[PDB]
């Protein structure tokens, strides 16, 4: 009949699809490119800007911009291009026909929700929509009503404790470390080895190095002692021009900055200490049930060994007599989408949508009272 669209804007990947199918059928980077060189050949069909996988294919000749930086949409005209491309080109669905469900990080400005709703109603003319918290959806995806969700995408990291379906909004922690600033750190440490990646395309190459070769050390000091003392740890990767580059301790040393943000020069503590300091803000009757579920979400939690490092040092911080259990399904990169796909297909949810009747009556202000 009619099936909601479910869209998660992220940073980096857009992923979108229809409610009640099991994986997104559009996934592509949320990137806009504009050509920067003088075009020479007459009659080429040359085009003003490219979106998504087009801008990855041509990235040699483009400045690549991300319209979202730390879950905040900084540039609105490019974000409309990305949604227009999602509905018409990727899904090939006319948005007037479908409720749309949109996903957002907690504790970010209200103007961001007001603009997302004003755009979905006025330009797309979407009949109904909703804006959902990213972390809440990872519990729907993992089959739980309880747990402290740790979520890290590109941009924002956040913890959200939930207990029997009640959020605990005073205990939500948000941290700007994750994912892009690991890549801007990797580009900085690789220069120490004599490789230089400056342009916005070379940043996409370094992102691919990070996704292939990085992993998290169980003990960071033992592995720096080992990698100083051996070649055994060292892997080599082939650049798009067929050069080959060799990467040593940099590969474990890059994601360690999740646990020691002082490397990039942040004040705040690592993801293990914001998780523990988030459980410490919950009342003592529930902590046992949060230590027994920690749900990792989003792509920055995909590094090999990040679960076993998290469990090791949270088991160091926690009281001795408790199970600490880290839940990290292999699919977790899609968990926020899968959870929104479940949520948008419930029958109880069909009264939750903001309908255009209400937007016409109350204006975009409504989103704050009706949505979370």
């Amino acid at each position: 009949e009619t099936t909601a669209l479910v869209c998660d804007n992220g940073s980096g990947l857009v992923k979108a699809g229809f409610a009640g199918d099991d994986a997104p059928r559009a996934v592509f980077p949320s990137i806009v490119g504009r050509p920067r060189h003088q075009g020479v050949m007459v009659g080429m069909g040359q085009k003003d800007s490219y979106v998504g996988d087009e801008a990855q294919s041509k990235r040699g000749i483009l400045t690549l911009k991300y319209p979202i930086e730390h879950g905040i949409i900084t540039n609105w005209d490019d974000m409309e291009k990305i949604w227009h491309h999602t509905f018409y080109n990727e899904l090939r669905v006319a948005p007037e026909e479908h409720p749309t469900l949109l996903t957002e990080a907690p504790l970010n400005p209200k103007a961001n929700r007001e603009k997302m709703t004003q755009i979905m109603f006025e330009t797309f003319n979407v009949p109904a929509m909703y804006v959902a918290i990213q972390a809440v959806l990872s519990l729907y995806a993992s089959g739980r009503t309880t747990g402290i969700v740790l979520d890290s995408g590109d941009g924002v990291t956040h913890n959200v404790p939930i207990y029997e379906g009640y959020a605990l909004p005073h205990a939500i922690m948000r941290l700007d470390l994750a994912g892009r600033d690991l890549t801007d750190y990797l580009m900085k440490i690789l220069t120490e080895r004599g490789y230089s990646f400056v342009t916005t395309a070379e940043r996409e190459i370094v992102r691919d190095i990070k996704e292939k070769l990085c992993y998290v050390a169980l003990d960071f000091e033992n592995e720096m002692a080992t990698a100083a003392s051996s070649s055994s740890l060292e892997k080599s990767y082939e650049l798009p021009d067929g050069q080959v580059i060799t990467i040593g301790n940099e590969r474990f040393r890059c994601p360690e900055t999740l646990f020691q943000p002082s490397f990039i020069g942040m004040e705040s503590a690592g993801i293990h200490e914001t998780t523990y300091n988030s459980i410490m803000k919950c009342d003592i009757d529930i902590r046992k049930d949060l230590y027994a579920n920690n749900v990792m979400s989003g792509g920055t939690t995909m590094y090999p060994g990040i679960a076993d490092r998290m469990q090791k040092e949270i088991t160091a911080l926690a009281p001795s007599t408790m199970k600490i259990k880290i839940i990290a399904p292999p699919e977790r990169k899609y968990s926020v989408w899968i959870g929104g796909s479940i949520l948008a297909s419930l029958s109880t949810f069909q009264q939750m949508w903001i309908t255009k009747q209400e937007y016409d009556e109350a204006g975009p202000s409504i989103v704050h009272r009706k949505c979370f």
């Binding site: 930086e69 730390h70 905040i72 900084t74 400005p109 700007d176």
Partner: peptide, 7 residues
Amino acid sequence: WXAXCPA
């Protein structure tokens, strides 16, 4: 952002 961080 609008004050503290750059976005």
